[PDB]
């Protein structure tokens, strides 16, 4: 389904987690796509931060939970593909795509998407998907902002 | 540029600790040169460029032409990299670029994630996620 970016690295390295907080990355990318934020809240330390940087940032653990719940009553994420993941400094950062869907219109989305996540002793402190937010809505045709 | 609230205190987050952590963080100065025939000298032969909410560039040439183009309407006055990362040859840098629409005179920070491929020091891939809209309705300038 999700094609290789023309541009994905051909360094094999460069797709697989090579750290513990790449892992960790890795596993919640999987865990996304149960669209459970009780789930993926698990993830996260009680001082953190979530956004969506198209959206508002959720801060703190309660605002993460309720900030991804309330994407997960709109939006299925299908899939999550990782072309790239690095790390330094604490952040690790993934290019992605993330297959969404509307649930309202049952529209699927192949969203682009490049994320840095701030990890603290293998929990999430800071997650920021970077993405064009109109390509989406317009595509699924879902009202997000 | 006010530091975001979530960005990294610990101060090598945003300092280059690699060569191609340097060469790129060097060359989002040189964005601020506005100057597309400056900035594709960064830029491997075999290279691509996306702003991801607009199509890719592939090849040198075409990369310069769009730097070029964008920069007829818009300025680059200020990249301020809060995170610089990088792994398995790929830089990332968190930043927002104060961006200047020419045509309205308008400016807006746009929050930028940005993923940087190099090549024995040269860019042969550098691709920028961030919001358009955002942009475009701070600017009055819609560039899609």
Do not use: C
Not at 44 to 68: H, I, K, S
């Amino acid at each position: 389904k999700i094609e290789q970016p023309r541009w994905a690295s051909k360094d094999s390295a460069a797709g697989a987690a090579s750290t513990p907080d790449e892992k960790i990355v890795l596993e919640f990318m999987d865990a996304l796509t149960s669209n459970d934020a009780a789930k993926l809240i698990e993830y996260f330390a009680e001082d953190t931060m979530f956004q969506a940087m198209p959206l508002p940032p959720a801060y703190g653990r309660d605002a993460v939970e309720q900030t991804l719940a309330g994407l997960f009553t709109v939006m299925s994420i299908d899939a999550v593909e990782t072309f790239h993941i690095g790390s330094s400094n604490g952040l690790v950062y993934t290019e992605r795509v993330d297959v969404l869907r509307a649930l309202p219109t049952g529209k699927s989305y192949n969203l682009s998407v490049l994320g840095v996540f701030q990890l603290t002793e293998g929990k999430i402190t800071g997650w920021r998907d970077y993405f064009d937010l109109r390509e989406f809505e317009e595509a699924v045709d879902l009202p997000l902002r």
